[PDB]
């Protein structure tokens, strides 16, 4: 269950398709917790492609439901990212993730 809460500006028409490699200034946030990840720290804005199951399921659907210049606010359910397992030491079991996602890409 990916629940978008869009902060408005962008274009709203350049939608991500297959065979497209995109660039995101994401920022992790644990719900009822602190930060765990930020692409804004390293200033390398995480170039990745669409469809090849690189990212988790919750971030993959939320990326496709955006457009260029937009600023979303994800809420990834446990069953789509880690909630059975949990990423070891970093993400606990049965976790619900919060993402500040900005798509400033190409293609």
Curated annotation (Swiss-Prot):
The keyword Isomerase applies. It is found in: Cytoplasm; Sarcoplasmic reticulum. It is an enzyme of class 5 (isomerase). Its EC number is 5.2.1.8. The keyword Isomerase applies. SUPFAM superfamilies: FKBP-like. Detected in heart muscle (at protein level). Isoform 1 and isoform 2 are ubiquitous with highest levels in brain and thymus. Transmembrane segments: none annotated. Keywords: Cytoplasm, Isomerase, Rotamase, Sarcoplasmic reticulum. Inhibited by both FK506 and rapamycin. GO terms for biological process: 'de novo' protein folding; calcium-mediated signaling; insulin secretion involved in cellular response to glucose stimulus; negative regulation of calcium-mediated signaling; negative regulation of heart rate; negative regulation of insulin secretion involved in cellular response to glucose stimulus; negative regulation of release of sequestered calcium ion into cytosol; neuronal action potential propagation. Residues 19-107 form the PPIase FKBP-type domain. GO terms for molecular function: calcium channel inhibitor activity; calcium channel regulator activity; FK506 binding; peptidyl-prolyl cis-trans isomerase activity; signaling receptor binding; transmembrane transporter binding. One of its GO terms (cellular component) is calcium channel complex. PROSITE patterns: FKBP_PPIASE (PS50059). It comes from the Eukaryota. It catalyses: [protein]-peptidylproline (omega=180) = [protein]-peptidylproline (omega=0). InterPro entries: FKBP-type_PPIase, PPIase_dom_sf, PPIase_FKBP_dom. Identified in a complex composed of RYR2, FKBP1B, PKA catalytic subunit, PRKAR2A, AKAP6, and the protein phosphatases PP2A and PP1. Interacts directly with RYR2. Belongs to the FKBP-type PPIase family. FKBP1 subfamily. Has the potential to contribute to the immunosuppressive and toxic effects of FK506 and rapamycin. PPIases accelerate the folding of proteins. It catalyzes the cis-trans isomerization of proline imidic peptide bonds in oligopeptides. PANTHER family: PEPTIDYL-PROLYL CIS-TRANS ISOMERASE, PEPTIDYL-PROLYL CIS-TRANS ISOMERASE FKBP1B. This is Peptidyl-prolyl cis-trans isomerase FKBP1B. The gene is FKBP1B.
